[PDB]
Structures are given as structure tokens and as C-alpha cells.
Amino acid sequence: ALPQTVRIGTDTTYAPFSSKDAKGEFIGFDIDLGNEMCKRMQVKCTWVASDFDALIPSLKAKKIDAIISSLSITDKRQQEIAFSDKLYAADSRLIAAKGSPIQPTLESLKGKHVGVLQGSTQEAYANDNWRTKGVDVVAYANQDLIYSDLTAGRLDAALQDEVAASEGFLKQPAGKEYAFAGPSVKDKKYFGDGTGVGLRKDDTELKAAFDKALTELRQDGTYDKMAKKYFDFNVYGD
Numbered sequence: 001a002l003p004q005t006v007r008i009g010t011d012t013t014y015a016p017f018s019s020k021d022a023k024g025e026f027i028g029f030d031i032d033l034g035n036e037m038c039k040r041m042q043v044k045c046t047w048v049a050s051d052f053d054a055l056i057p058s059l060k061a062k063k064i065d066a067i068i069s070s071l072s073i074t075d076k077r078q079q080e081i082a083f084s085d086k087l088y089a090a091d092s093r094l095i096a097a098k099g100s101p102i103q104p105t106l107e108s109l110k111g112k113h114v115g116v117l118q119g120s121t122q123e124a125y126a127n128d129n130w131r132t133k134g135v136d137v138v139a140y141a142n143q144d145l146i147y148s149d150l151t152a153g154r155l156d157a158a159l160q161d162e163v164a165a166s167e168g169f170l171k172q173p174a175g176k177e178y179a180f181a182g183p184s185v186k187d188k189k190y191f192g193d194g195t196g197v198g199l200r201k202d203d204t205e206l207k208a209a210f211d212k213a214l215t216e217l218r219q220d221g222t223y224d225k226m227a228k229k230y231f232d233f234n235v236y237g238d
């Protein structure tokens, strides 16, 4: 009993995983993966754009049926929703201006303005660890706003997924003067283990269909054909 049309929510301001092209078509690695999996599930799929923090609310209220949006699989989120198997890995890392002394440490960040996406694992981490101790942590409605304010000099740093900052900003014209500030911030408690399709806890049939399709496209080498369009390293981790 899978629906005829599976409605998939995503936030299109997180290139190279999810954004929109010049005509306003959805593009990116999350979109490619979702469409391949729908093709193997033999369902029809509609993509529904949303703000990142509205995705899990819309899922719970049945306005969409699945979330593919670099949604990290964390212990907190599993208390609310279910997840497919891992689609790819996702570490977190700070970016600041090139030459910045900034490190991902309280002592370095106290009194700085750090941008984080509202609803993200990074907002959770920064609020507990940094906002309480005097770092000016600013939550943003979407990631594009964060990159804008950083280049505007309104932010000193921004915490987001590492590959999104890399491919989506630092290797782009806009990010030429910026760089990663320190190594990735590892914290198992906050950042989870890779990303997956978020689904309602009771939609086990739909979880099984996505997992079967993900295993099939990984097995035959499709995942890697698709990943190579965007990455030259192994995005899956392993």
C-alpha cells in the first residue's frame, strides 16, 4: 500500500544537495537520489520545497510523505520520525574569512557572530555549546542568507555541513576569500551518523521500499555514477 504519489520535501538552499536552477527546477544530489529511488520503487514522486525547520513538522502532519534534504540521522530525531539507511555522510565544519584566527573553540568564538541554519543539528550544537557562553549565535531561515551575511561582513563565521560549504560556497566565485576555520567538529551526540530519508514511524512499507531501492542502486554502481557528477571523493563515507 505505497501511495501513488510520494510527496518529498526538501529545502532548496543547500547546494550541491538541493537547490533550484535558473528556470526554478529542483537540482542536486538529493534530488538525483530521490528520483532514482522513486524510479526503482515504481512510484510517482512530487518534490515540495520548504524551509528546513518546517520539514519534520510537515512530515508529521502528512503534508509530505518523506524528507530528503541532508537530514542527518540523530538519536533525537529518531524519537520523532524513522529514517531509511544512510544516503551519505555529513560532517560539520566552520567557515570564516581566509586568514581568520578563528577556530571552532569557545575562547576563539566568544563575542563573535556565528550563523547557523534554524532547525539544524548545527543550531542545536551552537545553542547549547556556544550561545550560552557568550558567542553571538544567529539562527537563519535558510543557508543562502548565511552566506550573504558572511560576505557582507555581518557574520564572522558560519557552521553548516562541510561538503555543502565546500562545494556550495568555497569552490564558488562568492567563497573565494573564505576558508574552513579549523577541522570538522566531531560530536556524535549532536551530528548523528550520515543523512537519510526521514519518514513517519508507522510508514514501514515505505521505509522498506526506499531501503530496497537504495541497496539496488548502490549495488549496480548507479550511486557512484551519480555521485561523480558532483564529487571527486567518496561522499558516502563508508
Ligand SMILES: NC(=[NH2+])NCCC[C@H](N)C(=O)O
Pocket (backbone or CB within 6 Å): 010, 011, 012, 013, 014, 018, 052, 069, 070, 071, 072, 090, 117, 119, 120, 121, 122, 143, 161
Ligand atoms: N537542505 C538543508 N537545508 N539541509 C540542512 C542539513 C543540515 C544538517 N545536516 C541537519 O540535518 O540538520
